[PDB]
């Protein structure tokens, strides 16, 4: 399903797909999941994370 995202935590590539580590709203740190970029509809949170690397 589609859930609200609280923060993007990390980024990786697995089997040719870009993935982002998502912290879900209402979920805990145990609920974080890696989701491919096609699953993501949180551009503001993605950009904040990438800008936050550097």
């Amino acid at each position: 399903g589609e859930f609200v995202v609280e923060k993007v935590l990390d980024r990786r590539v697995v089997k040719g797909k870009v993935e982002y580590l998502l912290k879900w709203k209402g979920g805990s740190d145990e609920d974080n999941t890696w989701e491919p970029e096609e699953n993501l509809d949180c551009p503001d949170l993605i950009a904040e994370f990438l800008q936050s690397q550097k």
Partner: peptide, 8 residues
């Protein structure tokens, strides 16, 4: 806007 994502 609403920050959402699909969960696999």
């Amino acid at each position: 806007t609403k920050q959402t994502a699909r969960k696999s």
